[PDB]
Design a protein around this ligand. Structure first.
Ligand SMILES: O=C(O)Cc1c(Cl)cccc1Cl
Length: 167
């Protein structure tokens, strides 16, 4: 049993809810919250901007030190950093950004990072400002992640379309 409440069960291991990932993290304090990161860990907008704002910019300060030491992530890659006030850990995962022309096949590689964690609160990778089709992102998630993933979808309209269209 875990703390997550109000989710619809899609599969054995994948759950979904219409929720603000920031407000969900604040309530649950999950072991792992996933950030929709870019390779520079520049948390300007979308999910990353919202998570970072909720940490009062402490996520960005930590991230800048990580990049200064290690250099940029790979598209499809990840790093584990602090969850600050939101979670124990933040798994920063880089899905391909269609608005930069990145290979959508890298979305499966991105989701494979989730398998290193038994339970996660996450957004749909590569959707939102990254430009991918969220329906596709959900299919790749279900067909790739084997650990228990709780997906937060902010827009009620997209949430309802993801559920209604789910095979
Ligand atoms: O949650 C939403 O409504 C839209 C959304 C964002 Cl903002 C970021 C990543 C994935 C998705 Cl699906």
């Amino acid at each position: 049993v875990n703390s997550f409440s109000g989710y619809l069960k899609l599969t054995d291991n994948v759950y979904i809810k219409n929720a603000d990932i920031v407000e969900e993290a604040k309530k649950v304090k999950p072991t792992v919250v996933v950030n929709a990161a870019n390779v520079y860990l520049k948390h300007g907008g979308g999910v990353a901007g919202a998570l970072n704002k909720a940490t009062n910019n402490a996520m960005q300060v930590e991230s800048d030190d990580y990049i200064a030491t290690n250099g940029p992530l790979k598209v499809g890659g990840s790093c584990v950093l602090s969850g600050h006030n939101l979670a124990k850990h933040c798994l920063h995962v880089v899905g391909p950004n269609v608005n930069k022309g990145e290979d959508i096949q890298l979305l499966k590689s991105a989701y494979e990072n989730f398998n290193q964690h038994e339970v996660l609160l996450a957004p749909l990778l590569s959707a939102g400002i990254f430009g991918a089709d969220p329906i596709h992102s959900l299919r790749v998630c279900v067909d790739t992640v084997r650990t228990n993933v709780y997906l937060a979808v902010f827009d009620k309209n997209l949430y309802d379309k993801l559920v209604s269209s789910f095979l």
